[PDB]
């Protein structure tokens with residue numbers, strides 16, 4: 001096996017790893033690193049090439065292409081450099097200092113984020129998704145863990161990451177998709193319909209629901225009820241939960257959390273919803 005990307009000797013020459021670990025998955029690890037040349041902070045994603053006994057260099061090359069494709073989009077994280085060693089491919093990504101928006105969806109930080117902030121963040125998530133769909137790219141993994149912030153004091157801008165699930169419209173529903181956290185799967189993924197751009201619009205409704213109410217819209221007593229809630233679209237719009245959420249926001253969420261993907265609006269339409277037309 002031969003190496004394609006820059007040598008690991010170069011990575012150790014130009015960068016220094018730190019003790020800060022940003023994320024650890026099963027086959028990927030994200031460590032913070034500093035450039036020796038300039039001192040700038042970056043995020044290094046280490047991706048194991050062998051997974052479950054299969055060569056996955058091709059999968060990683062796909063993720064790089066997509067990252068490369070949306071380099072002009074500020075709503076998508078920027079790929080700076082790529083290195084490779086024996087077992088890993090290393091992605092030098094732009095550093096998101098604010099962390100995951102999942103932080104804001106918890107009640108601990110509920111009182112520091114207002115509806116005027118959610119409107120802006122959701123308007124930025126749509127701009128990013130609009131770009132991906134303009135290029136026949138579905139993210140298929142827009143859970144709050146994969147949407148980051150450039151800053152949190154004060155609130156910054158969003159940065160979409162994690163393109164290991166990226167496909168192109170019309171692709172089949174392979175096993176990889178139907179394995180993510182059950183509470184974020186769309187209904188069309190559960191009965192094996194071909195994925196579409198509307199699959200992302202579902203997860204955008206969940207993110208907006210989770211930011212305004214600080215609650216998971218579908219999670220249940222066990223994974224089994226979670227599936228029933230999803231396939232029956234059993235969301236809670238009760239007065240006790242939405243007494244402090246505007247009506248325009250409820251209309252926005254209810255237009256996206258529809259069972260029939262054909263009825264969900266496109267990103268282009270969502271960017272025109274009355275709820276997003278505040279004059280900041």
Ligand SMILES: Nc1ncnc2c1ncn2[C@@H]1O[C@H](COP(=O)(O)OP(=O)(O)OP(=O)(O)O)[C@@H](O)[C@H]1O
Pocket residue numbers: 022023024025026028029030043045077093094095096097099100145146148161162163164165
């Ligand atoms: N550039 C970054 N800056 C800050 N944090 C990051 C950055 N990239 C990833 N993270 C954090 O690391 C965690 C895991 O990284 P990431 O989502 O990109 O890949 P993964 O889910 O572990 O694996 P795969 O891409 O194969 O699905 C994310 O939840 C995110 O919080």
Ligand SMILES: [Mg+2]
Pocket residue numbers: 145146162
């Ligand atoms: Mg992730």
